[PDB]
Design an enzyme around this catalytic site. Structure first.
Site, short mmCIF file in Angstrom:
data_model
loop_
_atom_site.label_atom_id
_atom_site.label_comp_id
_atom_site.label_asym_id
_atom_site.label_seq_id
_atom_site.Cartn_x
_atom_site.Cartn_y
_atom_site.Cartn_z
N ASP A 78 0.84 -1.19 0.00
CA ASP A 78 0.00 0.00 0.00
C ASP A 78 0.88 1.24 0.00
O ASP A 78 1.69 1.43 0.91
CB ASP A 78 -0.94 0.01 1.21
N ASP A 80 0.59 5.16 0.18
CA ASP A 80 -0.33 6.23 0.54
C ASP A 80 0.16 7.56 -0.01
O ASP A 80 1.34 7.90 0.13
CB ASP A 80 -0.50 6.31 2.05
N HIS A 115 -2.10 0.54 -4.94
CA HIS A 115 -2.00 -0.80 -4.38
C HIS A 115 -1.15 -1.65 -5.30
O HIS A 115 -1.31 -1.61 -6.53
CB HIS A 115 -3.38 -1.44 -4.21
N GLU A 139 2.82 0.83 3.38
CA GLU A 139 2.30 -0.19 4.27
C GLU A 139 2.26 -1.52 3.54
O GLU A 139 1.76 -1.60 2.41
CB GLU A 139 0.91 0.18 4.80
N1 LIG Z 1 -10.45 -3.97 9.39
C1 LIG Z 1 -10.30 -2.76 8.87
N2 LIG Z 1 -9.58 -2.59 7.71
C2 LIG Z 1 -9.42 -1.36 7.16
C3 LIG Z 1 -9.98 -0.25 7.78
N3 LIG Z 1 -9.68 0.84 7.04
C4 LIG Z 1 -8.94 0.44 5.98
N4 LIG Z 1 -8.76 -0.91 6.04
C5 LIG Z 1 -8.01 -1.72 5.06
C6 LIG Z 1 -8.63 -1.51 3.69
C7 LIG Z 1 -7.60 -0.73 2.91
O1 LIG Z 1 -7.52 -1.17 1.58
C8 LIG Z 1 -6.30 -0.99 3.66
C9 LIG Z 1 -5.37 0.21 3.62
O2 LIG Z 1 -5.99 1.30 4.27
P1 LIG Z 1 -6.07 2.77 3.62
O3 LIG Z 1 -6.39 3.78 4.69
O4 LIG Z 1 -4.76 3.11 2.96
O5 LIG Z 1 -7.28 2.72 2.55
P2 LIG Z 1 -7.12 2.42 0.97
O6 LIG Z 1 -5.71 2.06 0.59
O7 LIG Z 1 -8.05 1.30 0.58
O8 LIG Z 1 -7.63 3.75 0.21
P3 LIG Z 1 -6.87 5.17 0.25
O9 LIG Z 1 -5.49 5.00 0.82
O10 LIG Z 1 -7.67 6.13 1.10
O11 LIG Z 1 -6.77 5.71 -1.16
O12 LIG Z 1 -6.67 -1.28 4.99
C10 LIG Z 1 -10.71 -0.41 8.95
O13 LIG Z 1 -11.21 0.57 9.50
N5 LIG Z 1 -10.87 -1.66 9.49
CA LIG Z 2 -3.78 3.34 0.88
#
Ligand SMILES: Nc1nc2c(ncn2[C@H]2C[C@H](O)[C@@H](COP(=O)(O)OP(=O)(O)OP(=O)(O)O)O2)c(=O)[nH]1
Ligand SMILES: [Ca+2]
Ligand SMILES: [Ca+2]
EC number: 2.7.7.-
Length: 278
Positions: A78, A80, A115, A139
């Protein structure tokens, strides 16, 4: 077309799919079959991609997700805040990583991150999260957590590759829970400060929090310093040289000569706290 992506086809072999909903800045996983929140370690809280896409429609979730387990071959990388407003890599460490680790890459839901999904194993000596001065972060996880799936393929990297991940040591910091136990305890007791406001005396907020640290940490200066550096009161002034020391060390030393009582975890004399909660 998300089902034509080879990486999606590969992930479609596994019944480790969930859906997720946006809650504040978090993305909560949900059982794709009954609409309830999903555990990340219960295999029967998930479904296959057909049940996940049906649950995505049936409950109006925000997107699909995939749960990584230690038995599947997938590694989740990941990145960010690595994209600018035109979805081009603006961090040179991220661009270097994408050049050395060529596997399936997709743009994360916020649009400013990436990702990377690899078939392999994480090196044993790297930290899971690595933060950078420009706000970006790296990450890595291979189990115990789920990942959002957007299918927005980045620069045509639509195929999951089997690659050795020892080169992740060029980008992630190297490794060489009682602190969080103290931090969470202070929050439950209302002893955790919030961020300074415009009219606050920040240095006076430092001493109030340092005094509370002296009690809950038992005058363990090193522990008090470690916890302060992840508090909402941390700033550069904490490490500026001051007289024979630093402003932070003088603050923590002063708090111990001041506070009488001390919290002993073997006794749990929480009532001895000389300071009311915030
Ligand atoms: N169990 C759990 N998993 C989570 C939560 N929030 C995020 N995740 C998981 C799903 C995400 O794909 C992964 C990485 O978190 P991120 O904050 O970087 O979100 P993501 O990469 O999906 O989108 P973004 O970085 O905002 O563009 O962790 C949560 O509140 N609870
Ligand atoms: Ca992310
Ligand atoms: Ca895995």
């Amino acid at each position: 077309m998300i089902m034509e992506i080879p990486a999606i086809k590969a992930l479609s072999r596994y019944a480790q799919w969930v859906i997720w909903k946006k809650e504040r800045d978090t993305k909560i996983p949900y059982n794709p079959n009954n609409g309830k929140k999903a555990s990340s370690t219960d295999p029967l809280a998930w479904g296959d991609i057909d049940e996940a896409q049906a649950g995505l429609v049936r409950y109006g979730a925000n997107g699909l997700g995939f749960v990584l387990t230690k038995s599947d071959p997938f590694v989740f990388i990941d990145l960010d805040h690595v994209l600018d407003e035109n979805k081009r890599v603006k961090c040179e460490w991220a661009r270097q990583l994408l050049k050395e680790i060529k596997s399936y890459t997709e743009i994360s839901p916020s649009g400013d991150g990436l990702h990377v999904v690899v078939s392999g194993k994480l090196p044993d000596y790297i930290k899971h999260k690595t933060k950078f001065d420009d706000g970006s972060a790296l990450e890595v996880y291979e189990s115990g957590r789920y990942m959002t799936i957007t299918g927005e393929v980045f620069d045509g990297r639509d195929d999951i590759k089997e690659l050795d991940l020892s080169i992740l040591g060029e980008f992630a910091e190297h490794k060489i829970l009682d602190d969080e136990a103290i931090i969470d305890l202070m929050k439950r007791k209302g002893q955790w400060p919030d961020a300074p406001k415009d009219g606050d005396d920040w240095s006076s907020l430092d001493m109030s929090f340092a005094n509370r640290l002296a009690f809950w940490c038992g005058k363990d200066i090193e522990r008090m310093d470690r916890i302060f550096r992840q508090s909402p009161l941390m700033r550069q002034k904490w490490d500026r040289p001051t007289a024979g020391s630093t402003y932070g060390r003088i603050t923590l030393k002063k708090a111990c000569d001041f506070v009488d009582s001390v919290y002993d975890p073997a006794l749990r004399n929480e009532s001895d706290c000389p300071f009311e909660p915030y």
